Structure formats: structure tokens, C-alpha cells
Design a protein around this ligand. Structure first.
Ligand SMILES: CCOC(=O)[C@@H]1CS/C(=N\S(N)(=O)=O)N1
Ligand SMILES: [Zn+2]
Length: 257
């Protein structure tokens, strides 16, 4: 199926998913000089105090931390958004080396990794209906640079040994995603897509300006995961990022002056 290798990676996805060559694909390079401050934006409201994490899953592409989204427990509102978007999962994309791994870039700079907090618009009732709508999802993207450790990441790191291979999962209750955020909520926003197949053009992207710092040891443990299943030849889960796509007829707006 689709993946990140030479034979099944981003250059191939368009054959099964022709929207890969669409008009609002993600990620993109964020040209900071060209992005424009938008006074009509609002501050982001990130309300995660009642978040209920459930489980962590190696899906063969990344690992997802899943949340109970049966009620408004962890939601994103404000900023460019109309209404309320419920957190369903978060995951990362990362590199084989510290100089690559992010999906979005900032003036062509690649970060070591990128966190995606995925939310769906409650006006559509369920995630599957939301990803049939142009305003169905909001993804909060956060860059990771290597430096000091991120304390709020360490519980994630420590469970990765138990989900090494594709299809493995583990309990992951009582995790607080507030501990993954930087201090500032300043952001860039643009309309885009999922960055994995099916590449659906349903996402309002909200990319924070301030990266979080994680330690070399934390990201090293991401790179010990496997793309393959148990008992199969080991292929390290690294370089699970899609490169920047054409901006086409889009403007990136900034929340900050
Ligand atoms: C429709 C099924 O869900 C997906 O295919 C997932 C949901 S989040 C994502 N890509 S990303 N990296 O843009 O968050 N793909
Ligand atoms: Zn992602």
C-alpha cells in the first residue's frame, strides 16, 4: 500500500489518490515574508483541560495517541475557525537525521519533527462525515527542534517500546496534551489537506510559530519504531514526512504582527 519508501512514497501517491495533485494540498513552505498579518483573526482557544486520552497505536506510518471524542472534552476554537473542533488524535512526523522530518517548512527550513493535533468540526457529527467537507478538520501543527527535553513528551517516549511494530497498541489513558504546547499561540493559517493518503482537502491548518524543544534522546526513540509488523523484516520508522507541495491559489495568514 502507500508508504514513505522509494517504491510507495509521496511521488507515487497520485496514482491511487489523484487529489495529490490538487489545488489545496499540504504541507507547504511558509514564506514568512509573504505571509500577511490578518487583524480579522482571533486568538486560538485551545481547551484541553478535560481531554481523555485512550490508547496509542503504531499504524505502520506513525503512532497515534487517540482521544475520546464522543463529547466536547478537548476542543479547538477561535483563530480562523467557525464553531468547535474536537480533538480525535495526535501524531508526529520525523526524520532519520535532525535536519529533516517536518512537513511544513519555514522559509525552506526543515525542523526535526512536526506534531499534528487533529480535530474535527462538530457540526458534521462524526469524523468520517467531517472529512467529506471543506471545513471538516482543523490540524494544529507544532514544530520540534532538538535541544532541551520536553517533559510533557516523556510519557509518550516511554511507551514506544511496547508499540514497536505495525498494529501494536497500548493503553494510554490520563495523558495531558497541554504538555506538548509551546508558550506562544501565535500562528500561521491556510486551507489545505491531509498530508497522508487519502489526502482529502478538508483541513484548516494552524501552524504555531514557536517550536517546542525536545531532546536528542527523545527523538532517537521515535526512530527506533518500525514501519513493519512483528515477524517481518525490520524497517525503521523514519522519514515519514511528505515534502512541501505547490501553494497554488492560496495566501498564508499570520496571527501576529
Ligand atoms: C481520513 C482518515 O484519516 C487520515 O487519513 C488521517 C487523519 S490526520 C491525517 N493526515 S495529517 N498528517 O494531515 O494529520 N490523515
Ligand atoms: Zn500528520
Amino acid at each position: 500500500h502507500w508508504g514513505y519508501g522509494k517504491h510507495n512514497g509521496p511521488e507515487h501517491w497520485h496514482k491511487d489518490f489523484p487529489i495529490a495533485k490538487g489545488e489545496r494540498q499540504s504541507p507547504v513552505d511558509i514564506d514568512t515574508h509573504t505571509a500577511k498579518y490578518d487583524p480579522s483573526l482571533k486568538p486560538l482557544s485551545v481547551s484541553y483541560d478535560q481531554a481523555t486520552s485512550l490508547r496509542i497505536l503504531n499504524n505502520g506510518h506513525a503512532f497515534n495517541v487517540e482521544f475520546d471524542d464522543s463529547q466536547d472534552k478537548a476542543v479547538l476554537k477561535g483563530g480562523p475557525l467557525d464553531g468547535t473542533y474536537r480533538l480525535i488524535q495526535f501524531h508526529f512526523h520525523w526524520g532519520s537525521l535532525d535536519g529533516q522530518g517536518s512537513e511544513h517548512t519555514v522559509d525552506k527550513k526543515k525542523y526535526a519533527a512536526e506534531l499534528h493535533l487533529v480535530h474535527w468540526n462538530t457540526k458534521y457529527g462524526d469524523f468520517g462525515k467531517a472529512v467529506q467537507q471543506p471545513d471538516g478538520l482543523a490540524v494544529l501543527g507544532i514544530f520540534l527542534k532538538v535541544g532541551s527535553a520536553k517533559p510533557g513528551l516523556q510519557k509518550v517516549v516511554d511507551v514506544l517500546d511496547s508499540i514497536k511494530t505495525k498494529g501494536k497498541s497500548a493503553d494510554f489513558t490520563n495523558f495531558d496534551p497541554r504538555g506538548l504546547l509551546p508558550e506562544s499561540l501565535d500562528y500561521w493559517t491556510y486551507p489545505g489537506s491531509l498530508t497522508t493518503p487519502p489526502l482529502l482537502e478538508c483541513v484548516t491548518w494552524i501552524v504555531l510559530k514557536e517550536p517546542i524543544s525536545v531532546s536528542s534522546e527523545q527523538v532517537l526513540k521515535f526512530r527506533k519504531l518500525n514501519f513493519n509488523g512483528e515477524g517481518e523484516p525490520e524497517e525503521l520508522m523514519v522519514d515519514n514526512w511528505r515534502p512541501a507541495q505547490p501553494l497554488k491559489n492560496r495566501q498564508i495568514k499570520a496571527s501576529f504582527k
